[PDB]
């Protein structure tokens, strides 16, 4: 497939280009899912405190470490700082809680989950009397400085951002006194939301892009029948058929050939294995351009409750 398993980040570390997603993976199933993934070759797991399943993911990681199926140095564990913890004095604790839950002493990568900070408290989405999200007066630059401290304290090897538009990425890159550049911007990306502008921009700066919801997140809670469906798109199934692969495998191989990292989620053992079997074939440049042609700027994750937040990322073109 002419395809290396890892790429180089701007912190000097290598990141496996294929990871296991864990959003929506039920806590009673995610431990098995992660164990199976490690058994069949995954070395990169994507996590978040807001997913509420980090403890159970941690159980799997710890068993595989204890059993010497894999060494810690071979794993690449990613988590994300939730929006209610953007305050300077809350970032370390949030990171430590994630570390404790995952049963790790460091993260390979820690991302600001969204550019939008919310009021701190027990609620992940604090709403006013009217149902609008209650912002915090923290800005992304001070949050970034807090993230940089995590590196200097040994808690995380790399820091990054997620759902940042190109102007927000630029704000960080131009932050006065910037100490560490974002290593990664994790964004939604698939044939219905191809992200050429943002990807090219990030890559030109040495920022690696991770593509999330690469299968179109068919299990997203807000899905409706009228929504397009990547996995059922006959045009994509045709390309898969031509290559004797599954539609999902094509959808995973797609971002890989764009020098993106990709993190398909599954709790199904058979699909976990299938999804990893994407290093044995190549999409043609024609295949790639054809898949790109399907773009319709359609977002699974639009964060509709925060469209008035000053830092809402999706008003901008890219
Ligand atoms: N803000 C953010 O940074 C953000 C936002 C969204 C997602 N993410 C990350 O990206 C990960 C992946 O995105 P996602 O969870 O939104 O959706 P996704 O990976 O595009 O799709 C997951 C869905 O696809 C199904 N599936 C997986 N493999 C399949 C296969 N081979 N054939 C048919 N169906 C298959 C899964 O079913 P089963 O599980 O039942 O097998 C699940 O319903 C997330 O888990 C999360 O880690 C991050
Ligand atoms: C896009 C999205 C994701 C994926 C992500 O951020 O990784 C997510 C993950 C969670 F664990 C919880 C909520 C969300 C979410 C959007 C969202 C959902 C509900 C609400 S309340 C209005 O019902 C508001 C926003």
Swiss-Prot record:
Top-rank taxon of the source lineage equals Eukaryota
| Residues the record lists as Phosphoserine modifications | 5
N-acetylalanine modifications at: 4
Q: Which InterPro entries match?
A: AKR (IPR020471), Aldo/ket_reductase_CS (IPR018170), NADP_OxRdtase_dom (IPR023210), NADP_OxRdtase_dom_sf (IPR036812)
The terms under GO molecular function for this entry are: aldose reductase (NADPH) activity; all-trans-retinol dehydrogenase (NADP+) activity; allyl-alcohol dehydrogenase activity; electron transfer activity; glyceraldehyde oxidoreductase activity; glycerol dehydrogenase (NADP+) activity; L-glucuronate reductase activity; prostaglandin H2 endoperoxidase reductase activity
Q: Which Pfam families match?
A: Aldo_ket_red (PF00248)
Gene Ontology annotations of biological process type = C21-steroid hormone biosynthetic process; carbohydrate metabolic process; cellular hyperosmotic salinity response; daunorubicin metabolic process; doxorubicin metabolic process; epithelial cell maturation; fructose biosynthetic process; metanephric collecting duct development
Q: What is its EC number?
A: 1.1.1.21, 1.1.1.300, 1.1.1.372, 1.1.1.54
Q: In UniProt terms, what function does this protein have?
A: Catalyzes the NADPH-dependent reduction of a wide variety of carbonyl-containing compounds to their corresponding alcohols. Displays enzymatic activity towards endogenous metabolites such as aromatic and aliphatic aldehydes, ketones, monosacharides, bile acids and xenobiotics substrates. Key enzyme in the polyol pathway, catalyzes reduction of glucose to sorbitol during hyperglycemia. Reduces steroids and their derivatives and prostaglandins. Displays low enzymatic activity toward all-trans-retinal, 9-cis-retinal, and 13-cis-retinal.
Q: What is this protein called?
A: Aldo-keto reductase family 1 member B1
> What are the leading ranks of the lineage?
Eukaryota, Metazoa, Chordata, Craniata, Vertebrata
């Amino acid at each position: 497939s002419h395809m290396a398993s890892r790429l180089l980040l701007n912190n000097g570390a290598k990141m496996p280009i294929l990871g296991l997603g864990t959003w929506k993976s039920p806590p009673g199933q995610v431990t098995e899912a992660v164990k199976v993934a490690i058994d069949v070759g995954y070395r990169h797991i994507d996590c978040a405190h807001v997913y509420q399943n980090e403890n159970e993911v941690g159980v799997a990681i710890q068993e595989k470490l204890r059993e010497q199926v894999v060494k810690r140095e071979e794993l690449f564990i990613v988590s994300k700082l939730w929006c209610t913890y953007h305050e300077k004095g809350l970032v370390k604790g949030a990171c430590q809680k994630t570390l404790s839950d995952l049963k790790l002493d460091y993260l390979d990568l820690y991302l600001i989950h969204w550019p939008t900070g919310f009021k701190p408290g027990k609620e992940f989405f604090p709403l006013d009397e009217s149902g609008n999200v209650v912002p915090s007066d923290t800005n992304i630059l001070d949050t970034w400085a807090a993230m940089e401290e995590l590196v200097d304290e040994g808690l995380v090897k790399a820091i990054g951002i997620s759902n940042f538009n190109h102007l927000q990425v630029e704000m960080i890159l131009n932050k006065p006194g910037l100490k560490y550049k974002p290593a990664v911007n994790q964004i939604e990306c698939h044939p219905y939301l191809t992200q050429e502008k943002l990807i090219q921009y990030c890559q030109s700066k040495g920022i690696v892009v991770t593509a999330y919801s690469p299968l179109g997140s068919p299990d997203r809670p807000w899905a409706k029948p009228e929504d397009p469906s990547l996995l059922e798109d006959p045009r994509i199934k045709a390309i898969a058929a031509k290559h004797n692969k599954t539609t999902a495998q094509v959808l995973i191989r797609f971002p890989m050939q764009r020098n993106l990292v990709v993190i398909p989620k599954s709790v199904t053992p058979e699909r976990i294995a299938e999804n990893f079997k994407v290093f044995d074939f190549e999409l043609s440049s024609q295949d790639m351009t054809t898949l790109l042609s399907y773009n319709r700027n359609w977002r699974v994750c639009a964060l509709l409750s925060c469209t008035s937040h000053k830092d809402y990322p999706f008003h901008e073109e890219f």
